[PDB]
Design a protein around this ligand. Sequence first.
Ligand SMILES: CCCCCCCCCCCCCCCC(=O)OC[C@H](O)COP(=O)([O-])OC[C@@H](O)CO
Length: 67
Amino acid sequence: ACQASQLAVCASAILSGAKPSGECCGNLRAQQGCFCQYAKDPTYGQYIRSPHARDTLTSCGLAVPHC
Ligand SMILES: CCCCCCCCCCCCCCCC(=O)OC[C@H](O)COP(=O)([O-])OC[C@@H](O)CO
């Protein structure tokens, strides 16, 4: 139901770009709902369309948006 918090911890990488993290790719899983549809969300388009974002999720290889 869109937590908007389980991913915040990752935002550090998406926005700033400190360093990825495994927990990140895991947090989204707990969602597997809004996270998927979020792919359409324009306001957060900068988050999903990030450079390190796709890398983090891909590194895990669990679920990719655009579903
Ligand atoms: C409160 C702030 C937090 C923000 C909310 C976060 C919401 C979670 C969504 C995160 C999603 C990030 C993943 C990046 C999505 C993306 O841009 O897609 C890249 C994708 O991996 C590329 O697909 P592709 O390889 O071109 O697909 C074609 C291929 O399948 C066939 O060859």
